[PDB]
Design a protein around this motif. Sequence first.
Motif, PDB file in Angstrom:
ATOM      1  N   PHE D  78       6.162  41.646   6.913  1.00  0.00           N
ATOM      2  CA  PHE D  78       7.034  41.965   5.718  1.00  0.00           C
ATOM      3  C   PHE D  78       6.822  40.791   4.800  1.00  0.00           C
ATOM      4  O   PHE D  78       6.468  41.031   3.571  1.00  0.00           O
ATOM      5  CB  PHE D  78       8.392  42.349   5.929  1.00  0.00           C
ATOM      6  CG  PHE D  78       9.093  42.671   4.771  1.00  0.00           C
ATOM      7  CD1 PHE D  78       8.711  43.888   4.205  1.00  0.00           C
ATOM      8  CD2 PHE D  78      10.145  41.932   4.065  1.00  0.00           C
ATOM      9  CE1 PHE D  78       9.565  44.395   2.975  1.00  0.00           C
ATOM     10  CE2 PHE D  78      10.656  42.465   3.034  1.00  0.00           C
ATOM     11  CZ  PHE D  78      10.451  43.807   2.541  1.00  0.00           C
ATOM     12  N   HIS D  79       7.551  39.599   5.012  1.00  0.00           N
ATOM     13  CA  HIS D  79       7.671  38.601   4.386  1.00  0.00           C
ATOM     14  C   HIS D  79       6.278  37.686   3.947  1.00  0.00           C
ATOM     15  O   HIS D  79       5.687  37.620   4.718  1.00  0.00           O
ATOM     16  CB  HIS D  79       8.575  37.568   4.862  1.00  0.00           C
ATOM     17  CG  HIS D  79       9.912  38.260   5.251  1.00  0.00           C
ATOM     18  ND1 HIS D  79      10.034  38.790   6.153  1.00  0.00           N
ATOM     19  CD2 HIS D  79      11.216  38.556   4.276  1.00  0.00           C
ATOM     20  CE1 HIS D  79      11.368  39.339   6.612  1.00  0.00           C
ATOM     21  NE2 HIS D  79      11.899  39.338   5.244  1.00  0.00           N
ATOM     22  N   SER D 103      10.324  37.077  13.186  1.00  0.00           N
ATOM     23  CA  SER D 103       9.740  38.513  14.068  1.00  0.00           C
ATOM     24  C   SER D 103       9.026  39.127  12.593  1.00  0.00           C
ATOM     25  O   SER D 103       9.242  38.486  11.619  1.00  0.00           O
ATOM     26  CB  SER D 103      10.976  39.326  14.353  1.00  0.00           C
ATOM     27  OG  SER D 103      11.631  38.899  15.333  1.00  0.00           O
ATOM     28  N   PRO D 104       8.154  40.240  13.027  1.00  0.00           N
ATOM     29  CA  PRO D 104       7.240  40.443  11.780  1.00  0.00           C
ATOM     30  C   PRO D 104       8.151  41.197  10.641  1.00  0.00           C
ATOM     31  O   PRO D 104       7.474  40.740   9.552  1.00  0.00           O
ATOM     32  CB  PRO D 104       6.554  41.598  12.409  1.00  0.00           C
ATOM     33  CG  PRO D 104       6.371  41.157  13.999  1.00  0.00           C
ATOM     34  CD  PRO D 104       7.760  40.593  14.039  1.00  0.00           C
ATOM     35  N   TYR D 105       9.305  41.705  10.648  1.00  0.00           N
ATOM     36  CA  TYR D 105      10.016  41.993   9.844  1.00  0.00           C
ATOM     37  C   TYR D 105      11.482  41.786   9.651  1.00  0.00           C
ATOM     38  O   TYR D 105      12.300  42.204   8.833  1.00  0.00           O
ATOM     39  CB  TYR D 105      10.245  43.752   9.861  1.00  0.00           C
ATOM     40  CG  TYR D 105       9.091  44.615   9.357  1.00  0.00           C
ATOM     41  CD1 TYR D 105       7.675  44.413   9.848  1.00  0.00           C
ATOM     42  CD2 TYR D 105       9.321  45.259   7.893  1.00  0.00           C
ATOM     43  CE1 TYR D 105       6.496  45.036   9.173  1.00  0.00           C
ATOM     44  CE2 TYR D 105       7.908  45.939   7.663  1.00  0.00           C
ATOM     45  CZ  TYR D 105       6.813  46.093   8.296  1.00  0.00           C
ATOM     46  OH  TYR D 105       5.812  46.549   7.673  1.00  0.00           O
ATOM     47  N   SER D 106      11.601  40.478  10.244  1.00  0.00           N
ATOM     48  CA  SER D 106      12.799  39.531  10.249  1.00  0.00           C
ATOM     49  C   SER D 106      12.831  38.210  10.545  1.00  0.00           C
ATOM     50  O   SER D 106      11.864  37.836  11.123  1.00  0.00           O
ATOM     51  CB  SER D 106      13.734  40.513  11.057  1.00  0.00           C
ATOM     52  OG  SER D 106      15.040  39.944  11.219  1.00  0.00           O
ATOM     53  N   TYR D 107      13.635  37.623   9.946  1.00  0.00           N
ATOM     54  CA  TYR D 107      13.892  36.160  10.428  1.00  0.00           C
ATOM     55  C   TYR D 107      15.009  35.531  10.261  1.00  0.00           C
ATOM     56  O   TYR D 107      15.723  36.017   9.404  1.00  0.00           O
ATOM     57  CB  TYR D 107      12.654  35.226   9.542  1.00  0.00           C
ATOM     58  CG  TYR D 107      12.741  35.136   8.297  1.00  0.00           C
ATOM     59  CD1 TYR D 107      13.765  34.097   7.959  1.00  0.00           C
ATOM     60  CD2 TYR D 107      12.098  35.711   7.463  1.00  0.00           C
ATOM     61  CE1 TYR D 107      13.897  33.911   6.383  1.00  0.00           C
ATOM     62  CE2 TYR D 107      12.312  35.579   5.914  1.00  0.00           C
ATOM     63  CZ  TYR D 107      13.053  34.746   5.259  1.00  0.00           C
ATOM     64  OH  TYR D 107      13.339  34.386   4.162  1.00  0.00           O
TER      65      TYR D 107
END
Lengths: 115, 115, 115, 115
Positions: D78-79, D103-107
């Motif tokens: 995502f980011h 993580s792919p959509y979170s950090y």
Amino acid sequence: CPLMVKVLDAVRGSPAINVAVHVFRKAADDTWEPFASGKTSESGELHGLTTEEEFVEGIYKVEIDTKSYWKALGISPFHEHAEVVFTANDSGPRRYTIAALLSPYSYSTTAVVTN
Amino acid sequence: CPLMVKVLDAVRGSPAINVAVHVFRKAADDTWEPFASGKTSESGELHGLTTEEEFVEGIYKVEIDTKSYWKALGISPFHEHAEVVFTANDSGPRRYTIAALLSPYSYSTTAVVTN
Amino acid sequence: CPLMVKVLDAVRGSPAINVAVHVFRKAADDTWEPFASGKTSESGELHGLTTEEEFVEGIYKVEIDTKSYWKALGISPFHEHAEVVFTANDSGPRRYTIAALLSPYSYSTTAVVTN
Amino acid sequence: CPLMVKVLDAVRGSPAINVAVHVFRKAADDTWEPFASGKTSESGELHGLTTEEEFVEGIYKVEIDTKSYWKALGISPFHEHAEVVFTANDSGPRRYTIAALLSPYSYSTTAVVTN
């Protein structure tokens, strides 16, 4: 050192020191047998819980006593403790770092597993 | 409902759907007695677990079945489940949302307690 | 609304209220041009930032003013603000929720992208 | 070593290696001057970015190139990147560890500050 626990304080941006940690292993009778215990040091780390020989395959529970930690700082937190439950060494021996990041009403926990 | 559970998937950036959740209440003998259970909806939420009448002060455990969730997605996870243990108190706010953010080798949990 | 922001306070176990949020769009010259702004509500949510028509593909930056939030609470924080930078894509789901979980020396951010 | 960056991968439960990191310092003219850069090692750590002498008071931005990291693993995250912005050394010199959990959509990102 096959099992290490590291705890940080997200309010102060510092290691969480003197945090009690109790480890249990699931027995053949489906109960939680006490396996090891200790407290984190000035670095927020807990070393020497076990040895490669003792740390056989099984399901382990790492209980981090977060409530007592926050209470000593004048804080009444949400959780009684942080529990971390996992199968270990099912594909041969590994080294496990169990990390926890603490806030009064929230925590995260991460596992770093190396061969 | 006084107790709600909300789960997100950090890998897909989405609600975590069809995640099994089991709630337990700590009994007089210190054992965990089943209290309520359910599966998260398409919105990642689980409502209707209990009622104002039944949800009395005490220690509760909310078990989130993360292992099965990752398994269904073909992704190797670390934890057996995520465990959230806390004391319910009549004093503060009366609505408890147990939020969880899931990754294969890490999770975070937060209590959002409001009126 | 195609873009929503939701903020939680990990210290108090509550929505983070009155948190200022500024959204920027990356311009042709690589500079950040103001796009939208607002304050989170009593529910910790910020709705109505933009519209389906205006929210075209491109790179956006969502700036969460965490320093002022902690300052107002008398708590010393680490970060100046939390920055969330991402590309908006017409392909996948059309609703973007930028979630953030705040502690004084740590924060987490997750994108929940759905239909 | 007054400034260190550590990055972990929440999908694999391992250090995040070869992650590019760019550090900037806010100049007197309100612009972001490049300050230091590097990439994480096999341990997921980046050492030697700067020295106590060079690392004066100021506002710093640590940009972690997460998108490139995930893309190399076949993942479209995502980011664009994780940005960490903070005032440093305003109360005298300190040592800063900037941690990030991906993580792919979170950090999540955490700062450990010691004296």
